[PDB]
Amino acid sequence: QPVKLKAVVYALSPFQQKIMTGLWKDLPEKIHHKVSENWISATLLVTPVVGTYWYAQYFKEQEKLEHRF
Amino acid sequence: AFAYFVLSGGRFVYASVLRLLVLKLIVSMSASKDVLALASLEVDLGSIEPGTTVTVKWRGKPVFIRRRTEDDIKLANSVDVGSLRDPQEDSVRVKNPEWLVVVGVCTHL
Amino acid sequence: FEGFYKLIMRRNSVYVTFIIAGAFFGERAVDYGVHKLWERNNVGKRYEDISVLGQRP
Amino acid sequence: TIDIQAAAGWGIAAAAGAIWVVQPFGWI
Amino acid sequence: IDIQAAAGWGIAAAAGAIWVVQPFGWIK
Amino acid sequence: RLVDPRKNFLARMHMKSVSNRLRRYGLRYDDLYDPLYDLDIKEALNRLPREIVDARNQRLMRAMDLSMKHEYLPDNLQAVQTPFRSYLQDMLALVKRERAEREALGALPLYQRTIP
Amino acid sequence: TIRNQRFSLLKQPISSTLNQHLVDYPTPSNLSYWWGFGSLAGICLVIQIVTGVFLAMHYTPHVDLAFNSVEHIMRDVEGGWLLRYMHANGASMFFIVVYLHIFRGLYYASYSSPREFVWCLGVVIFLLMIVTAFIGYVLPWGQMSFWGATVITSLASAIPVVGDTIVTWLWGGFSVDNATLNRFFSLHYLLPFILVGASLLHLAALHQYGSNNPLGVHSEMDKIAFYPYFYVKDLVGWVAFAIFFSIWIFYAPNVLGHPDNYIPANPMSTPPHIVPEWYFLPIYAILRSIPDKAGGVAAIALVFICLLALPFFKSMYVRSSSFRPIYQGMFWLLLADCLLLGWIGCQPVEAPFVTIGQISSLVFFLFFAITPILGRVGRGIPNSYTD
Amino acid sequence: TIRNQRFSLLKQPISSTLNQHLVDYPTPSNLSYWWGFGSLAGICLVIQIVTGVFLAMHYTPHVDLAFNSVEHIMRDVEGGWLLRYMHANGASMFFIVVYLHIFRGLYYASYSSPREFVWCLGVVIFLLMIVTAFIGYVLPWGQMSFWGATVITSLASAIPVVGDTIVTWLWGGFSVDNATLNRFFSLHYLLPFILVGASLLHLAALHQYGSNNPLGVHSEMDKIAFYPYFYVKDLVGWVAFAIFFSIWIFYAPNVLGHPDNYIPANPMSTPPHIVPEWYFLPIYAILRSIPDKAGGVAAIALVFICLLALPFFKSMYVRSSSFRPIYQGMFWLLLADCLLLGWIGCQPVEAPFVTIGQISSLVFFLFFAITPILGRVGRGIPNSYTD
Amino acid sequence: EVPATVEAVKTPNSKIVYDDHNHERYPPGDPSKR
Amino acid sequence: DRLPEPYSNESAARFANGGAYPPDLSLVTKARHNGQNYVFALLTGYRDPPAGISIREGLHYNPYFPGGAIAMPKMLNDEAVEYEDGTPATEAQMGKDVVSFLSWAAEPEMEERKLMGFKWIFLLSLALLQAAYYRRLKWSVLKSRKLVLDVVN
Amino acid sequence: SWAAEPEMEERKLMGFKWIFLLSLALLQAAYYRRLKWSVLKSRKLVLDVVN
Numbered sequence A: 001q002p003v004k005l006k007a008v009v010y011a012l013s014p015f016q017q018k019i020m021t022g023l024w025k026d027l028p029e030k031i032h033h034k035v036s037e038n039w040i041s042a043t044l045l046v047t048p049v050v051g052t053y054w055y056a057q058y059f060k061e062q063e064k065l066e067h068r069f
Numbered sequence B: 001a002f003a004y005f006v007l008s009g010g011r012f013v014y015a016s017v018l019r020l021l022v023l024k025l026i027v028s029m030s031a032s033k034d035v036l037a038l039a040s041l042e043v044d045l046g047s048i049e050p051g052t053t054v055t056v057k058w059r060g061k062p063v064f065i066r067r068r069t070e071d072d073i074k075l076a077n078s079v080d081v082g083s084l085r086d087p088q089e090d091s092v093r094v095k096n097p098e099w100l101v102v103v104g105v106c107t108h109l
Numbered sequence C: 001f002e003g004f005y006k007l008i009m010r011r012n013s014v015y016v017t018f019i020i021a022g023a024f025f026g027e028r029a030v031d032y033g034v035h036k037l038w039e040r041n042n043v044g045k046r047y048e049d050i051s052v053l054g055q056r057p
Numbered sequence D: 001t002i003d004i005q006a007a008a009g010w011g012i013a014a015a016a017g018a019i020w021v022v023q024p025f026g027w028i
Numbered sequence E: 001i002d003i004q005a006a007a008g009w010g011i012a013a014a015a016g017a018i019w020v021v022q023p024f025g026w027i028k
Numbered sequence F: 001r002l003v004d005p006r007k008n009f010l011a012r013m014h015m016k017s018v019s020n021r022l023r024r025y026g027l028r029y030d031d032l033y034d035p036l037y038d039l040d041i042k043e044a045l046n047r048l049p050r051e052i053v054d055a056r057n058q059r060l061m062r063a064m065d066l067s068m069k070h071e072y073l074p075d076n077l078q079a080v081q082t083p084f085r086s087y088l089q090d091m092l093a094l095v096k097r098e099r100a101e102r103e104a105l106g107a108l109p110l111y112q113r114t115i116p
Numbered sequence G, H: 001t002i003r004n005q006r007f008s009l010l011k012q013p014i015s016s017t018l019n020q021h022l023v024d025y026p027t028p029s030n031l032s033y034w035w036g037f038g039s040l041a042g043i044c045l046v047i048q049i050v051t052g053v054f055l056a057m058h059y060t061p062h063v064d065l066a067f068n069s070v071e072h073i074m075r076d077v078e079g080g081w082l083l084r085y086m087h088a089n090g091a092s093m094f095f096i097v098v099y100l101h102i103f104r105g106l107y108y109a110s111y112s113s114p115r116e117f118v119w120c121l122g123v124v125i126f127l128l129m130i131v132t133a134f135i136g137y138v139l140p141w142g143q144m145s146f147w148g149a150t151v152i153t154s155l156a157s158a159i160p161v162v163g164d165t166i167v168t169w170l171w172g173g174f175s176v177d178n179a180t181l182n183r184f185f186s187l188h189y190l191l192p193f194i195l196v197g198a199s200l201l202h203l204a205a206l207h208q209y210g211s212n213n214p215l216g217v218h219s220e221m222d223k224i225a226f227y228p229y230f231y232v233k234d235l236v237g238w239v240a241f242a243i244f245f246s247i248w249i250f251y252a253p254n255v256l257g258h259p260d261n262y263i264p265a266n267p268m269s270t271p272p273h274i275v276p277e278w279y280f281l282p283i284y285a286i287l288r289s290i291p292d293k294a295g296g297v298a299a300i301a302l303v304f305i306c307l308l309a310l311p312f313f314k315s316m317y318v319r320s321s322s323f324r325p326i327y328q329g330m331f332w333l334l335l336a337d338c339l340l341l342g343w344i345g346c347q348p349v350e351a352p353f354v355t356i357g358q359i360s361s362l363v364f365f366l367f368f369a370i371t372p373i374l375g376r377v378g379r380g381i382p383n384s385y386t387d
Numbered sequence I: 001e002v003p004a005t006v007e008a009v010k011t012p013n014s015k016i017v018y019d020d021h022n023h024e025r026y027p028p029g030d031p032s033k034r
Numbered sequence J: 001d002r003l004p005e006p007y008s009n010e011s012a013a014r015f016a017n018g019g020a021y022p023p024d025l026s027l028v029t030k031a032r033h034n035g036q037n038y039v040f041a042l043l044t045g046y047r048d049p050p051a052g053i054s055i056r057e058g059l060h061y062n063p064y065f066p067g068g069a070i071a072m073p074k075m076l077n078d079e080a081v082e083y084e085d086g087t088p089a090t091e092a093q094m095g096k097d098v099v100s101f102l103s104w105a106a107e108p109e110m111e112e113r114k115l116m117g118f119k120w121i122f123l124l125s126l127a128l129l130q131a132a133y134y135r136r137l138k139w140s141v142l143k144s145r146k147l148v149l150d151v152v153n
Numbered sequence K: 001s002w003a004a005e006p007e008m009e010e011r012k013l014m015g016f017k018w019i020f021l022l023s024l025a026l027l028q029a030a031y032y033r034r035l036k037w038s039v040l041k042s043r044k045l046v047l048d049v050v051n
């Protein structure tokens, strides 16, 4: 079923705009946004992997030293 | 009522044909006659040192051999049969006091 | 770039031949250059650089 | 009178492509 | 109509299993 | 009640996080309800006035444009957003209440989902 | 309009079906690059089929010639090393792309209504992919191939009464031998074509309602044609994938594999370390987490039961994790847990990996048991969070 | 109507395309039993795929094992003789029902407008069927497998410049050897799945206009549903074909072939009577009649050019041979010529068979030369025969 | 009050401003970059 | 002709080597973890066992071998070979040379593979820049569009 | 003769049984087709046209 919309849209031709310079425009703010929104998500993905890996190396090292005469 | 009888008659054949063609396909993957031919043989063995094992060969299956020492048998004869998931004494498994012969394939996979 | 546009981009048939030529000549130019870097990075390690080559008794 | 020019320009494209996929420089 | 039909199809499925797989000897 | 923000401080942060996320795109929480998700929703949407649906459809188009552009609502527009101003929940409850009444009396359903 | 004359050739009956499903199909304008992995998986499937057809012109499915025919591909046929490495590492690229594809649908709740059948067809495709890649890995007939085929056919023995007769029917004998290899080759040719049909039905289910979008909202008010907008966006991913694929092919063609499969299969000696390919390790870890034969096999089936039942849980009406903070957090924990399970399957079965494997398996199943609770509880969010 | 509720399950989106294309599709009510060989051809294709897949689980594509693995199927595989005979004779059955399918179309002018794409897709299907059948016949690696392949892979040498280059690339060497057999096996697995896809396109292209009928007239006023009227009409033909097939499988399993394929291939000696399968004989007799290698290959191509060009010749507006008595007799002469060409093909090259083949090849091509002029003359029939 | 869309349809504007977060326009009247 | 076999079959090899099979060396650097370094370290790594470790007669201690007991004896004694070019054939020199030979034998396509990889990764990188520009050129009309709507909140 | 065709006896016994069964299925199939088509084949069609 079609929607029934009322809007005004202005568009400029692709051959009247700069195409690539927008990739490195306000670069610091982009990084700021990415770390600000996603630091909780990155912690919930990185902490269990690194924590479990670190414990396994910690376990294997001690177990290797108890069996050593 | 009459037409149901006539139609059921040919449905007996239709189901029978379906059964045959499917079962022929399935059974063609079962073990072939030459594969079943090589399914029985016996070999002879020698000897080894006290405390080591030498894998031997059969159909596609290895067989383990382990002549056990005295303290080895003491160890193997101090296990609670109740605590075992498969309660069995070492003397039942062995036809010799020290010579332990067993099919060397894990019963898991 | 409009002078270039007037000779090559005006007709697709020419512009297609331009892409086939550039695929040919571009590929050959990269082939030579990668081989020159490999020769310059591996001095003395080639089969023609075996000193006793041809002298096996 | 362009169809003859489009034919001639697409034949040149076909000939360049053929010399490009098969590169028979050792055979010429 | 719901339990009767369920038992009827359950009978049909069991007969079909006995018909496709014929384990006459597994009755031990 | 654990879900009530006036009592549970974790529910307060939950509301704040959701409200901040909706505000960035100009969306209301009811705009996240899709007619395709559930037939009760599209029955409720059809019962709402044209002006309500037009504003919802416009807020959805505005958010999609922002989402496409990787940009947010300007901060002077975010200040006037009303993320939890409701227009759909009361109608949706009524529609579901009428469906339960039909079921309790053995009536046929007024609308059914197609089997995909 | 009355179609007396002929307009655009795309709308003629010769090309109308192709035009309306590939050129003009409406797509949500705010799709991100995470929506480019369906076409990447389609390309990987084509790459596997094309290279495998040409590899099958040189491979001999016989236990006395299989290993040497692969070595003859790598040594004698012109460009044979490339066909082999594009096929062996292509299966890895097939599974990386499809895994990213799956977690995209998990993050944005793309499995929810009305797209339950799309997810269900995808789960079947995953099963078809696993079987297809597994039996293919047996074909070189190395040490990993032989002992890998031994245990997975033995999986049927977990059934008490008819388990042993299924295992032997699968083998075609009393052991993994030429009968197993020859039938694995035949099934490995057929299954990819069934994968093609399944992915076509998968796509047709998706076109019933259109694609989901990162906001998870109704998207009919802002849609654009697939061509050229998402063709050129997919083309960016296709080239990026080619660079990624080429690094593996030319500079590291053996890191995603084990050296044990360069030893011809020896039925007498197991290798000390026996593992599947990396894309199967998370299933491997869940299997060994259970200290019971039937328990382990039942857990493996319950993995695909939970995936199939996921779209049918009574959930809240919000799809995307960008508006679901608790579900968003649980998704990243599931992703970390899945990475942990794959690493555990790569380890020998001893302390502390048994305890870690058992906890990782439990947390994986906790994701699917808790999600219906979340939607059920979050149904009351609008009535509790008021303006 | 407003589809608020769910009506018949067949009309729901899960099964609407099967309902519309298979079950409810309108069909002319006066179709004869000649219109039931299209489904038979599809069933023959399915049998070949199913038996071929299970035969490939036991066959080895190596020159040192191919002949003996086919003998191992006939002897050791439980049910192997039936799989091999259902496939070897199924190939003959495939070509019988397709030849009757083709001649049905020629008699009723089924190639005429608006179904030219249907006929063109059929001709492509015929070419794929020939290639699939030929490379499959090489798989047993008997005497006729080896010498049949040596000829056809040499058909490329008629090209002057690159003819020898194509032959050796086709062979994979300098003679027919293991590289040729290994590549024929891979292509023999892949071509039937392309053949399935082409038949699906063929069926779709026909359904754009519906089938032609014996009267050759507009049939919209008397159309009925395919199910169950032409389902039970086709089922009668399916059961009769099963009887016909069973007689070949169980009582004459080897009369359709030649005993020479039961001798293992010998590259040194040459069988004094080298012939193809019987369904390639008419083409093979056309090739033999031209006393020039290049001319013979040109004539074989001209056969498929003539077939592809039939639908596009300006013709009269009447379709059925039931109202075109000259085209009717013209058709019955072609069928006798086609039967003559097959018989001549089995005969060796000597008098009088050389001349008979040359006249018979002439009579075959005269059909496609005299067909267009007959339409140009026949367009004036209504003016001439007035009331 | 008059809705924003109605004002735009009633008042053609020769000073159109485009969204410049992703792309910056060339100055008006510049030659096309084709 | 292939390089000749020392024994007639695997059982003959085991009979000549105390029941142990000298493996085929065509793929050994690909058939072991860290294979090139493994083969070098194993050949040059024969030494005395650690205190309290005894080795069964007929076996030699090598810590790089798993288990530490290898049926191979030390074979790379100094001047065990004489070179054609005039390189001092020490244990370490022969160990280096024989692994270069074995590594090439496992992967004779490496040089062609590496020349192909550098060429195409560079070219595909160029296409990725053009792919990005092409995508951005097509989408610019959408990304810079100005949308006017009636709604406020 | 037996060495070339060791399956002749099993193959022959299958042929007689299944051709007998398939012939019976042909009779049922003929009756089924004609039963289903009888409503169509016996119908009386009245139109206005003559020539």
Ligand SMILES: COC1=C(OC)C(=O)C(C/C=C(\C)CC/C=C(/C)CC/C=C(\C)CC/C=C(\C)CC/C=C(\C)CC/C=C(\C)CCC=C(C)C)=C(C)C1=O
Binding pocket: G050, H130, H131, H134, H135, H144, H147, H148, H149, H151, H152, H153, H170, H187, H274, H275, H276, H277, H280, H283, H284, H287
């Ligand atoms: C006495 O002597 C004779 C016989 O002996 C007994 C005969 O039996 C016959 C009868 C035989 C026939 C009628 C069959 C002949 C006709 C055909 C078409 C041959 C069938 C065709 C072939 C065998 C050729 C097979 C084709 C190939 C190998 C093509 C290979 C190419 C492939 C697969 C793809 C090409 C690759 C690319 C384009 C690269 C990219 C591809 C991608 C997929 C990405 C005759 C006449 C005869 O006088």
Ligand code: HEM
Binding pocket: G034, G035, G036, G037, G038, G039, G041, G042, G045, G098, G101, G102, G105, G108, G110, G111, G115, G118, G119, G122, G123, G125, G126, G199, G202, G203, G206, G210, G211, G212, G213
């Ligand atoms: C060979 C394997 C697969 C192929 C070729 C494939 C192909 C596709 C394509 C082309 C799309 C639409 C475009 C896109 O969203 O990228 C899609 C969407 C989807 N796929 Fe698959 N897919 C595969 C595997 C899977 C699997 C294994 C699953 C789940 C277990 C799955 C679930 C989905 C879902 C839910 C969508 C809709 C996503 C949305 O609209 O946001 N797919 N698939």
Ligand code: HEM
Binding pocket: G045, G048, G049, G050, G052, G053, G055, G056, G059, G070, G084, G087, G088, G091, G094, G129, G132, G133, G134, G136, G137, G138, G139, G140, G188, G189, G190, G192, G193
């Ligand atoms: C119809 C298409 C296909 C054919 C004909 C085919 C054929 C083959 C052949 C002949 C081999 C053995 C040669 C070799 O080891 O490299 C092989 C190996 C393999 N195939 Fe396929 N294949 C096909 C599709 C696929 C697909 C779709 C997958 C992935 C799901 C796949 C995964 C593999 C894997 C993992 C191997 C083992 C690679 C190795 O370790 O060497 N193949 N295939």
Ligand code: HEM
Binding pocket: H034, H035, H036, H037, H038, H039, H041, H042, H045, H098, H101, H102, H105, H108, H110, H111, H115, H118, H119, H121, H122, H123, H125, H126, H199, H202, H203, H206, H210, H211, H212, H213
């Ligand atoms: C595997 C091979 C083929 C299959 C599976 C197949 C299948 C079918 C089917 C199911 C139909 C509709 C039902 C019918 O009229 O029987 C049909 C119609 C037709 N086929 Fe085939 N066919 C095959 C080969 C061919 C070939 C080789 C030709 C011509 C060279 C051809 C030409 C036609 C034509 C002209 C029709 C329309 C007939 C009419 O409308 O009266 N087909 N085909």
Ligand code: HEM
Binding pocket: H045, H048, H049, H050, H051, H052, H053, H055, H056, H059, H070, H084, H087, H088, H091, H094, H129, H132, H133, H136, H137, H138, H139, H140, H188, H189, H190, H192, H193
């Ligand atoms: C994907 C499906 C198919 C597969 C896997 C397949 C595979 C095989 C195999 C393994 C053989 C050798 C076993 C034997 O000698 O009987 C064979 C033979 C043969 N196949 Fe197929 N086939 C397929 C489809 C077809 C089709 C569609 C045709 C018909 C056009 C065909 C015609 C033949 C013929 C004529 C032989 C030789 C029979 C003989 O002389 O023994 N096959 N095929």
Ligand code: HEM
Binding pocket: J017, J020, J021, J022, J023, J025, J028, J039, J043, J065, J069, J070, J071, J072, J073, J075, J076, J098
């Ligand atoms: C420079 C000369 C040689 C080289 C480079 C070489 C290389 C190798 C390699 C790579 C292995 C594999 C060890 C493993 O599996 O980890 C091995 C094992 C072996 N080699 Fe050699 N070898 C040489 C000479 C010899 C000689 C001369 C003999 C016998 C006189 C011999 C007998 C063995 C045996 C018996 C083994 C297996 C030992 C075991 O597994 O316990 N090798 N060799």
Ligand SMILES: COC1=C(OC)C(=O)C(C/C=C(\C)CC/C=C(/C)CC/C=C(\C)CC/C=C(\C)CCC=C(C)C)=C(C)C1=O
Binding pocket: B025, B026, B029, G130, G131, G134, G135, G144, G147, G148, G149, G151, G152, G153, G187, G274, G275, G276, G277, G280, G283, G284, G287
């Ligand atoms: C050390 O251990 C292990 C391995 O080893 C190294 C492995 O690799 C794997 C990897 C395997 C996984 C993840 C599961 C594979 C799953 C399935 C379902 C494969 C089973 C299918 C097979 C063998 C072929 C299918 C055959 C059929 C359908 C018969 C055909 C018959 C007809 C058509 C009639 C695991 C878990 C493992 O623990």
Ligand SMILES: COC1=C(OC)C(=O)C(C/C=C(\C)CC/C=C(/C)CC/C=C(\C)CC/C=C(\C)CCC=C(C)C)=C(C)C1=O
Binding pocket: G197, H021, H022, H023, H025, H026, H027, H038, H039, H041, H042, H043, H045, H046, H196, H199, H200, H201, H203, H211, H226
């Ligand atoms: C009115 O029009 C119609 C006809 O004309 C008068 C017909 O004659 C028929 C009957 C004949 C048919 C359907 C021919 C079979 C179809 C094709 C395309 C020929 C070859 C098909 C093959 C080999 C099928 C393989 C495809 C598969 C298995 C697809 C996967 C699907 C499943 C496993 C379910 C039908 C239904 C029809 O309506």
Ligand SMILES: COC1=C(OC)C(=O)C(C/C=C(\C)CC/C=C(\C)CC/C=C(\C)CC/C=C(/C)CCC=C(C)C)=C(C)C1=O
Binding pocket: G021, G022, G023, G025, G026, G027, G038, G039, G041, G042, G043, G045, G046, G196, G199, G200, G203, G206, G211, G226
């Ligand atoms: C809006 O629409 C579209 C999408 O959004 C949902 C897409 O994601 C894509 C891109 C992805 C696609 C089409 C994935 C489909 C892949 C499949 C089914 C697996 C690989 C494909 C094969 C083998 C082709 C099968 C199709 C045909 C006709 C067989 C014949 C083809 C060949 C022999 C090459 C496209 C083109 C599209 O338009």
Ligand code: FES
Binding pocket: B106, B107, B108, B109, G151
């Ligand atoms: S097979 Fe030894 S434990 Fe699984």
